[PDB]
Ligand binder design. Structure first.
Ligand SMILES: OC[C@H]1O[C@@](CO)(O[C@H]2O[C@H](CO)[C@@H](O)[C@H](O)[C@H]2O)[C@@H](O)[C@@H]1O
Ligand SMILES: OC[C@H]1O[C@@](CO)(O[C@H]2O[C@H](CO)[C@@H](O)[C@H](O)[C@H]2O)[C@@H](O)[C@@H]1O
Ligand SMILES: OC[C@H]1O[C@@](CO)(O[C@H]2O[C@H](CO)[C@@H](O)[C@H](O)[C@H]2O)[C@@H](O)[C@@H]1O
Ligand SMILES: OC[C@H]1O[C@@](CO)(O[C@H]2O[C@H](CO)[C@@H](O)[C@H](O)[C@H]2O)[C@@H](O)[C@@H]1O
Ligand SMILES: OC[C@H]1O[C@@](CO)(O[C@H]2O[C@H](CO)[C@@H](O)[C@H](O)[C@H]2O)[C@@H](O)[C@@H]1O
Ligand SMILES: OC[C@H]1O[C@@](CO)(O[C@H]2O[C@H](CO)[C@@H](O)[C@H](O)[C@H]2O)[C@@H](O)[C@@H]1O
Ligand SMILES: O=N[O-]
Ligand SMILES: O=N[O-]
Ligand SMILES: O=N[O-]
Ligand SMILES: O=N[O-]
Ligand SMILES: O=N[O-]
Ligand SMILES: O=N[O-]
Ligand SMILES: O=N[O-]
Ligand SMILES: O=N[O-]
Ligand SMILES: O=N[O-]
Ligand SMILES: [Cu+2]
Ligand SMILES: [Cu+2]
Ligand SMILES: [Cu+2]
Ligand SMILES: [Cu+2]
Ligand SMILES: [Cu+2]
Ligand SMILES: [Cu+2]
Lengths: 341, 341, 341
């Protein structure tokens, strides 16, 4: 027992929600204990019911958000149940050494491993499976990616000496999928990940996804699963993309404070319309809602947003502010005396 | 009449030019009145005369640049003449609430609407049509996008307490187009936007444009339509892309001051070679010309620049500075005594 | 002889290595003399032995890194030997005027030219061939690109008044290639660049590379050609991409200090996981190695990294730090008493 710190077990929750944590803490460093269980399974990824052979951490795309503080140690038990068919591992972009931990975590079905990494770098970071060679992109675009947030012990700040505090946090994992089609253009189904591989790799090589989804499927965060907020709340939106660039935008809002490269040692940018998540990274945006109603959260390649699945909704309760925006005149016939050339 | 401010009607001009405005102002907030008239029409988009079924604000791709100051109110009359075939609306990324105004501006052919939004956020911002669902990307990549600039009341600054003033301003709207081809590879023509839709959507889904153009067509800002400047002038170049990333570069120049995310509350970066406009945003670059001659302004995917249409020219008058650059020896035969291995 | 400064001849070296230079200097400005010889040749670009008709500066993809200091003059002799088939030129993004020098350097086979440019802007910058029209992207994606670094005379700094010094420097040139395929999907071979052009241009137009390589071929910087370092060394990694965006990531490390837009007048960002090189630019990252072993340096589109060629290796000598990372428990059977749902 060389490392003599208190230990705290964390129970992960499914995205887009985040496990209970403190923003600012006066506790000293701890060993924060997390468990991730690999689950290979067929999953529905669009509104027409298209399936595909997914590979996940903890049964979700993305994998769950892990939250710790600068100077904590993160002790992760990775489990690969014997019902799975492939070896798996984990690479933390937050970690230092051994390919992020991938070189110390390769486990066959039936095995588990325990990795500890010190959280020396603040920000939001990707974690993903990376077995080796061509298996790396395949496992990641099959769903094996998530994120970790390493908060400063004093919480977030605006880079100019003022504390920032969120009222709510959501984790939006964006996934690019490469689903094979038959000669007629219909999506193909397979009985195992291994059976899907060869055809999937051919799609992957052309670098054009068939689907781009939030929380694992088209429409996952719309309708009854819209994200809730209230006028006045400061909401932190963490966005990850393990393989491909994204350009987040909150339709009808802004990013008040945006860390687009995702690292809290850098001052955020202010008042952004659209920001940029480079493939292989996580970023974060804070916004204080000023108006009630529906907001669409998109990647602002609108073809991807509307036609390949990458739209979420916020439903925001409160009172409308006519000073910020108003309909002066409702739709009406163009007046006869008008000249509109 | 709740809002008791002076009203000023603005007459928009066609890009790449910009309507008359003040950089710094000591006037108080005003209600700035703008009129935008939707025009569906066939347009020529390349040097071989390829046509396509465009949808525009005010008859241009991009739509005109609107310029106001922080704290002004922007009252926009959107008109959809009965000669048009589709409903249209407008979403201002500069605005707060109702999907940027899209949820308050949906108008059928024969109708108009009046929206007012308060200009609370400084920078350059996209505006675009967004009717709903798959119509959103289709209307935007058919040409229904422009930009608005919200200046600080004191004008631009370098983020370090020094005023910046431009001598000239140009607005470069970049448009990604998705023109269907027949089995031989020739571009297809249609008699209406509705007829073009199904084939266009198939091209859109593969996320590879057929054309990437400035000011609505290949070659629009070359030859007799090159952009004018003079040695010593500080020129502000506003660049928008409503759907797809761009990487602007001034060949033979630099960006002296660049707001690549486009928001004046953030200090600009200095001395850039190439900058990055994320899809769904506008950015701005200031450059003081130091040499006369032709400059090419490109997106620095050179395939897009040279082969898909995305090159503009500046023609700059003045005297050559041999200290910054000189041809020491003109092209000449390689000397016989040379060894060139 | 108007310009009366000392002259220093520099001998370029092949990437990823860099010619001898000083970081900080107290010498005054000099005329720094460089020679670049165009070489058209067939080159191997992947591990299956695929060839293609390359065009290079000095026989390498990328062309060599040139290093000077702010206020130096750079006098470049460009040579186009009579064994070559095409005209060539050079455009320095570091330079001011005449399309970066391209308008003053067009040379036929059998000719040479001498251009001088003043190094007024600090940072890392692309240089590339740009003959005119469609020849510009073709020459660049055929291999005719490199970089120049213009250091501040006091060396690098952290933008907050502290000097930064590297122990080692590597130049990673990333190249997107567009190799034609036959009806069966096999890569086509040609006897000259001219013969390859028409088919190559068709691939280029679809904006999807067949290969994305570091130092001119898949696997170039892996195995016996891995990049060396030691625990404790501060290594500067210069990364260029003349045509297409890249997202560099050091697997198992970070960017301690990153200039992603590549210009030293801007403070670096700290503690990045992944950074972004916009097409048509160079950037630079400093990292101090903390752990020994193998590191993969990738573009973090992992399909490009693993399947299209864009992976380099570092081999780092030193002692493992179990405080930063440790394998708490090696792979072992999942305990019988476990519940893993
Ligand atoms: O800010 C640059 C800095 O990163 C350093 C901090 O000094 O270290 C980072 O990783 C180290 C891992 O132990 C920690 O010192 C530090 O707390 C963390 O941000 C250096 O390697 C370098 O100056
Ligand atoms: O996309 C090509 C082509 O395939 C068809 C079926 O023949 O539809 C498929 O592709 C669509 C777009 O991805 C999906 O909407 C659908 O689930 C799928 O069957 C054609 O409709 C289409 O043109
Ligand atoms: O700088 C962050 C800031 O944005 C705020 C300003 O306090 O508001 C922005 O939008 C508001 C709309 O009324 C205005 O207060 C402000 O002038 C504008 O930049 C907050 O919501 C937040 O601190
Ligand atoms: O691009 C495919 C193929 O189509 C042809 C006509 O058969 O040319 C078309 O496509 C060209 C590239 O976009 C355009 O230059 C032209 O206007 C269009 O007819 C072939 O020439 C080409 O290989
Ligand atoms: O920082 C903005 C600045 O760039 C300027 C410097 O004053 O010039 C750059 O290019 C000039 C070329 O002579 C040099 O003055 C300078 O050393 C270099 O960074 C201006 O044109 C402008 O303020
Ligand atoms: O990529 C299409 C198709 O072509 C084949 C040969 O028929 O392989 C070629 O393409 C591969 C992927 O780029 C390369 O690995 C190889 O060098 C090349 O011959 C098929 O194997 C493949 O499905
Ligand atoms: O140690 N107190 O939270
Ligand atoms: O399946 N993912 O939320
Ligand atoms: O572990 N790879 O299939
Ligand atoms: O109020 N004067 O410009
Ligand atoms: O048609 N647009 O300039
Ligand atoms: O309004 N949409 O076609
Ligand atoms: O002038 N001395 O290095
Ligand atoms: O061939 N290039 O290193
Ligand atoms: O110089 N162009 O082939
Ligand atoms: Cu895996
Ligand atoms: Cu990774
Ligand atoms: Cu419209
Ligand atoms: Cu938008
Ligand atoms: Cu050339
Ligand atoms: Cu260039």
């Amino acid at each position: 027992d060389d490392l003599k710190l208190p230990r705290q077990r964390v129970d992960l929750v499914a995205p887009p929600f985040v496990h209970v944590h403190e923003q600012a803490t006066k506790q000293g460093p701890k060993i924060m204990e997390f468990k991730l269980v690999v689950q290979e399974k067929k999953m529905v990824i669009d509104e027409k019911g298209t399936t595909f052979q997914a590979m996940t951490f903890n049964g979700s795309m993305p994998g769950p958000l892990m939250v710790v503080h600068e100077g904590d140690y993160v002790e992760v038990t990775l489990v690969n149940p014997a019902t799975n068919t492939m070896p798996h591992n984990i690479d933390f972009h937050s970690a230092t050494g051994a390919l992020g931990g991938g070189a110390l975590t390769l486990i066959n079905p039936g095995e588990q491993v325990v990795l500890r990494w010190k959280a020396t770098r603040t920000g939001v970071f990707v974690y993903h499976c990376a077995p080796g060679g061509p298996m790396i992109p395949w496992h990641v675009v099959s769903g094996m990616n998530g994120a970790v947030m390493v908060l400063p012990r004093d919480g977030l700040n605006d880079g100019h000496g003022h504390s920032l505090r969120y009222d709510r946090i959501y984790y939006i994992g964006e996934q690019d999928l490469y689903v094979p089609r038959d000669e007629k253009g219909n999506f193909k189904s397979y009985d195992s990940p291994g059976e899907a591989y060869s055809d999937t790799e051919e799609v992957m090589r052309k670098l054009t996804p068939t689907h781009v989804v939030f929380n694992g499927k088209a429409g996952a965060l719309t309708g009854k699963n819209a994200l809730n907020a209230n006028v006045g709340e400061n909401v932190l939106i963490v966005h990850s993309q393990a393989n491909r660039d994204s350009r987040p935008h909150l339709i009808g809002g802004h990013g008040d404070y945006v860390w687009e490269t995702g690292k809290f040692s850098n001052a955020p940018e202010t008042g952004l319309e659209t920001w940029f998540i480079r493939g292989g990274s996580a970023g974060a945006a804070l916004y204080k809602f000023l108006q009630p109603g529906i907001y669409a959260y998109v990647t602002h390649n609108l073809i991807e947003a509307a036609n390949l699945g990458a739209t979420a909704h916020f439903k925001v309760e409160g009172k409308w502010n006519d000073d910020l925006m108003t309909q002066v005149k409702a739709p009406a016939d163009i007046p006869t005396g008008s000249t509109n050339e």
